Design a protein around this ligand. Sequence first.
Ligand SMILES: [Cu+]
Length: 125
Amino acid sequence: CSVDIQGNDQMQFNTNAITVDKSCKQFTVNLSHPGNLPKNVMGHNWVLSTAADMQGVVTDGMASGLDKDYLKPDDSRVIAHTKLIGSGEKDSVTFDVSKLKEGEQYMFFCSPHQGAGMKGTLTLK
Ligand SMILES: [Cu+]
């Protein structure tokens, strides 16, 4: 009921498909950032929404800027998220699996780099 995920200096996560076992009550993502670039140059977060909500979350988050960790404050569309991290920093987020529904499509992404392809699927199994 946990996954370790890395975001690197070239705007890539080390996975693009996360599976959450449906028997898990909570799920945890441990985000880290190998590489050498600091947060105000190549910062990453990990953000979860429905596939439908992803674009809005990214557009509104980018507009919110670096000091808001590239996320719209109190965004109802964001199921779970970490803070923004630079190289050598780490952050974890845990969420209730009850927040995911069978039949729905979910995406994870880094909001500042989602447009550059830093995204993937999250699926219940
Ligand atoms: Cu990123």
